[PDB]
Amino acid sequence: LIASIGELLIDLISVEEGDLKDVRLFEKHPGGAPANVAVGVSRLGVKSSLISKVGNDPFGEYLIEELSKENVDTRGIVKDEKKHTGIVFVQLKGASPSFLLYDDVAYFNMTLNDINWDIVEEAKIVNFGSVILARNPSRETVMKVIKKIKGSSLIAFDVNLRLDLWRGQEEEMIKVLEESIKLADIVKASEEEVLYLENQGVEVKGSMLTAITLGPKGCRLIKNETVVDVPSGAGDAFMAALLVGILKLKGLDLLKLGKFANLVAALSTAWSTPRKDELLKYKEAREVLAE
Amino acid sequence: SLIASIGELLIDLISVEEGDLKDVRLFEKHPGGAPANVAVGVSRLGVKSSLISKVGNDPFGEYLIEELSKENVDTRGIVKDEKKHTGIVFVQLKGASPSFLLYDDVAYFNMTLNDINWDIVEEAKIVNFGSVILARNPSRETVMKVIKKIKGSSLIAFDVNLRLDLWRGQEEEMIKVLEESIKLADIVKASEEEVLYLENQGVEVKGSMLTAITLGPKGCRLIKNETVVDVPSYNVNPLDTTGAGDAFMAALLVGILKLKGLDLLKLGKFANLVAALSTQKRGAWSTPRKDELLKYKEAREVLA
């Protein structure tokens, strides 16, 4: 079982191109990296859990319904009576994609009282990302959960850096990213993030494995000093693939992992992860999923 | 001659299809918030209109200010909040049970006394507010102070615009603030359902100068002291009645501003015509323009 903990939210995706100021039409989709990964993990045929918080509102109900349809365990999703479901307005189109994320929302309001401990304890891998850490009490709550399960579950961290979420608190940002990276067995980061954080004296590496995304150029898997370069919603598909691969591959065969993750990422091209039997025709997937 | 509106200014994300908000896939972005809608109506009727509100320092805040500006609504009294995002509400207008999901920790609910352009409020001959703004502090206390400050110097108009969902857990505070607001108002607008609800809790729903009671599609009623003027609706074929209430408010306020006295018949016929004509226009800003209204004698009384 893989648990994901963090943001679960409505993506209001701009139908047309343009600055958010000018966008007239939005399409509602479930979103939030950990949710996307959790769905991806489930579509790859692994039992997946999501720990998050939604509002007691139609949007919270929607997100829970959408996750349930994907066979993601939703028992760890709590309803906030005081905060509304996370929303972000997304412009994915253009040279400069943008977002307007509403921060005073349910997923940023997680306390330790909100944590389903059965789920965290059942998890072989716990996945979290930096977005959830942007605000307290969820930052504190998540960090305490990760610290706790450290050594009992593999910890996966997607740097998923959104500087906008850290304005006026960039000192704290670096501290929490560093602490989170240090806690992580598996780190996913873009090379932009790697550069940015290392230029800040933060080494971007998992204790077990590091996945560096390279955009068009594909990605890189690093395990100690073994480096596998694999030329090429997809990022979260890729993460789901990595975590599923890590869980499935007895001795962490990096070549197989790489090939599997690339395939899932390729076929994905926010819930874009291919289903298990979309991958049965591929030797690369059977290598991971069936053996 | 200025009419100032104060309160919520937000993005309406309007369901483009029928269904529960849970299930609605597509939302059209429009400017909303009753006082903004009234402010636009006032401007459309040819009267200087200012809106005091607060948006986020974000694209949605910029959008709202720009849309207001396009309508010639003075936007100088709109403050940008560096800590809260622009108001948003997801709205299902269609079906038997229209619904909304209003996000409350947003900029328009974060007004403090420092955010108030006192020059604008002191200039206003009429100041318009509604109950939605009162649902949260600091804006509630701030707005109540603005209204108390100008009581006696400008006419105060209050759209009861009651949204019970905005007051859960604070129903006693709501009744208190609604009563205090009504008691401060010269002009009160309320639906017959609001009148019943509030008056049955010992809150008289009456402005000191004038009360406009809306009866939905059936029309409305204007009350001054003991005088009741019933204004049945015109037998319109409506395109969209979403903006009719705010169009009606705008007409009432412009009418009161323009007429010699509180002539209920002239005011009723004008507000009726504006509302009727608003039904032919889509969306929350449906008030017809002065130039269109001038083609009718009921409007020429007030506007010309």
Nearest to A200 by CA among A166, A238, A224, A236: A166
Residue ranges of the annotated binding site of A for ATP are 188, 213, 218
User: Length of chain B, please?
Assistant: 304
How far apart CA B76 and CA B79 sit, in angstroms, is 8
Q: Where are the extended beta strands (E) located within chain A?
A: 2-5, 9-14, 25-31, 48-55, 77-80, 86-91, 98-101, 125-129, 154-158, 186-190, 209-213, 219-223, 226-230
Joined tokens for residue A78: 């709590």
Question: How far apart are the C-alpha atoms of B259 and A176, rounded to whole Å?
Answer: 64
Q: At CA B196, angle to CA B195 and CA B201, rounded to 5?
A: 95
Q: Is B28 on the interface with A (CB under 8 A)?
A: yes
B-interface mutation test, from A20, A80, A98, most B Cβ less than 10 A away:
A20
- Contact check, Cβ <8 Å, A102/B103: yes
Which of B21, B28, B59 minimises the CB distance to A58? B21
At A78, phi and psi to the nearest 5? Answer: -100, 150
Candidates A21, A61, A83; nearest CB to B59 = A21
Q: Please, are residues A9 and A88 in contact by the beta-carbon 8 Å criterion?
A: yes
The DSSP 8-state label assigned to residue A276 in this structure reads G
Helix axes B244-258, B264-278, angle to 10 degrees: 150
User: Residue A79: helix, strand or coil by DSSP?
Assistant: strand
Is the CB of A107 inside 8 Å of chain B's CB atoms? no
**Is B144:B133 a contact under the CB 8 Å cutoff?**
no
CA angle A84, A88, A89 (to 5 degrees): 130
Domain coverage including residue B154: 1-304
Asked if A20's CB is within 8 angstroms of B60's CB, the reply is yes
Q: Hey, are the CB atoms on B60 and A100 less than 8 Å from each other?
A: yes
Q: Does a cis peptide bond (omega within 30 degrees of 0) precede residue B138?
A: yes
User: How many domains does chain B contain in total?
Assistant: 1
Backbone angles phi, psi at B183, to 5 degrees: -65, -25
C-alpha torsion B21→B22→B23→B26, nearest 10: 50
C-alpha to C-alpha distance for A179 and B21, rounded to whole angstroms: 39
Gap between the terminal Cα atoms of chain A: 17
d(CA A43, CA A275): 5
Q: Which residues of B touch A15 (CB under 8 A)?
A: 26
Return binding residues of A. Answer: 188, 213, 218
Q: CA nearest B31 in A: which residue? A: A24
Q: Can you give chain B as a three-state secondary structure string?
A: CEEEEECCCEEEEEECCCCCCCCCCEEEEEEECHHHHHHHHHHHCCCEEEEEEEEECCHHHHHHHHHHHHCCCECCCEEEECCCCCEEEEEECCCCCCEEEECCCCHHHCCCHHHCCHHHHHHCCEEEEECHHHHCCCHHHHHHHHHHHHECCEEEEEECCCCHHHHCCCHHHHHHHHHHHHHHCCEEEEEHHHHHHHHCCCCCCCCCCEEEEECHHHEEEEEECCEEEEEECCCCCCCCCCCHHHHHHHHHHHHHHHCCCCCHHHHHHHHHHHHHHHCCCCCCCCCCCHHHHCCCHHHHHHHC
Q: From the CA of B90, how many Å to the nearest CA of chain A?
A: 10
CA-nearest residue of chain B to A59? B22
Q: Which residues pair with B230 in a beta bridge?
A: B221
The whole-angstrom separation of Cα B258 and Cα B304 is 9
Q: Output the six-digit token pair for B32.
A: 């909303």
- Taking CA atoms, A268 is separated from A40, A70, B23, in Å, by 10, 16, 25
The first and second tokens of residue A290, run together, are 């069936």
Q: Which residue has the tokens 């959830």?
A: A132
CA–CA separation, A267 and B139 (whole Å): 50
CA distance A254 to A260: 10
Check: CB of residue B204 under 8 Å from CB of residue B178. no
- The nearest CA of chain B is from the CA of A105 a distance in Å of 8
Residue type, B1: S
- Inter-chain residue contact A20 with B99, CB threshold 8 Å: no
Reduced to 3 states, what is the DSSP secondary structure of residue A250? coil
Give the gap in angstroms from C-alpha B84 to the nearest C-alpha of chain A: 8
What are A263's two structure tokens? 């395939």
Distance between CA atoms of residues A220 and B132, nearest Å: 53
* Nearest-angstrom CA–CA distance, B58 and B69: 17
* Tokens of residue B126, six digits: 């009429």
As a whole number of angstroms, the distance between CA A138 and CA A7 comes to: 9
Give the one of A20, A28, A102 whose C-beta lies nearest to B27's C-beta: A28
Q: With 0-12 CB in 10 A as exposed, 13-18 as middle and 19+ as buried, what is B261? A: exposed
Ligand-binding site membership of B245 (annotated) = no
What SS3 class is residue A164?
helix
Resolution given for this structure, in angstroms: 1.9
Q: How far apart are the first and last CA of chain B?
A: 15
CATH of the domain at A255: 3.40.1190.20
**Length reported for chain A:** 291
Contacts of A103 in chain B (CB under 8 A): 85
Q: Are B134 and B146 in contact (CB under 8 A)?
A: no
What secondary structure letter does DSSP report for A101?
E
Whether A20 and chain B come into contact, CB under 8 Å, resolves to yes
Residues forming beta bridges with residue B224, ordered by sequence position: B227
* DSSP annotation of A73: B
Please indicate whether, in this complex, the C-beta atoms of B28 and A24 are within 8 angstroms of each other. Answer: yes
CA distances B193 to A61, B160, B163, Å, are: 30, 11, 12
Q: How far is B239 from chain A (nearest CA, A)?
A: 21
The four Cα atoms B233, B235, B240, B245 give a dihedral, to 10 degrees, of 0
**Closest to A12 (Cβ–Cβ): which among B27, B62, B104?**
B27
Contacts of residue A8, defined as CB under 8 A and 6 or more positions apart, other chains included, come to: A30, A31, A32, A34, A35, A50, A52, A53, A54, A63, A67, A77, A86, A107
Phi–psi pair at A99, nearest 5 degrees: -150, 160
* Cross-chain residue pair B26–A24, CB shorter than 8 Å: no
